Amino acid sequence: LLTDEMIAQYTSALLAGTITSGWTFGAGPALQIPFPMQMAYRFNGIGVTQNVLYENQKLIANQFNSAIGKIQDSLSSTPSALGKLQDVVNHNAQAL
């Protein structure tokens, strides 16, 4: 029913909401808040005071970026991570 160009729109909407309004968009109206002030809320949630984030803001940012890059190289190598999605396809064909 849903073409592959609509699921992309759904995920894009979810990403934009979660990076521009925090978690407040899932429980009512969306209320904007700066991202470095949202990561402080998350840090306070896990049990670390917020003043840790700001005084170490820049460094943290770098770490995050690096991690993302590694993913882009991790999926291409080790050609067995997507097996959970691959097997399904194969299974159906086999049956037919």
Binding site: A27, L31, I33, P34, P36, M37, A40, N51, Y54, Q57
Partner: protein, 91 residues
């Protein structure tokens, strides 16, 4: 219910939102004051500290904020004053 159960969930939802100017911390005398359980807001001229889920502004005090280091490291530091509610009793 016949062959089943029904739940009535009672929940709480924010209704009317207003939107202000915000800052991460306040520098007073070379010291950065961070909120304890709130967030700094500004209505245009004055600065208050508010709980995150309901607009209830209050005066910034030393009992309401905690100090950590100096105000040379944080990015969006701003300039303001803190009451320190002991002067009237001192006199």
């Amino acid at each position: 219910a016949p062959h089943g159960v029904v739940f009535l969930h009672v929940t709480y939802v924010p209704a009317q939102e207003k939107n202000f100017t915000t800052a991460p911390a306040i520098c007073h005398d070379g010291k950065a004051h961070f909120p304890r359980e709130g967030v700094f807001v500004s209505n245009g001229t004055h600065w208050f500290v508010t709980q995150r889920n309901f607009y209830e502004p209050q005066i910034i005090t030393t009992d309401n904020t905690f100090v950590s280091g100096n105000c040379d490291v944080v990015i969006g530091i701003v300039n303001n004053t803190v009451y320190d509610p002991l002067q009237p009793e001192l006199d």
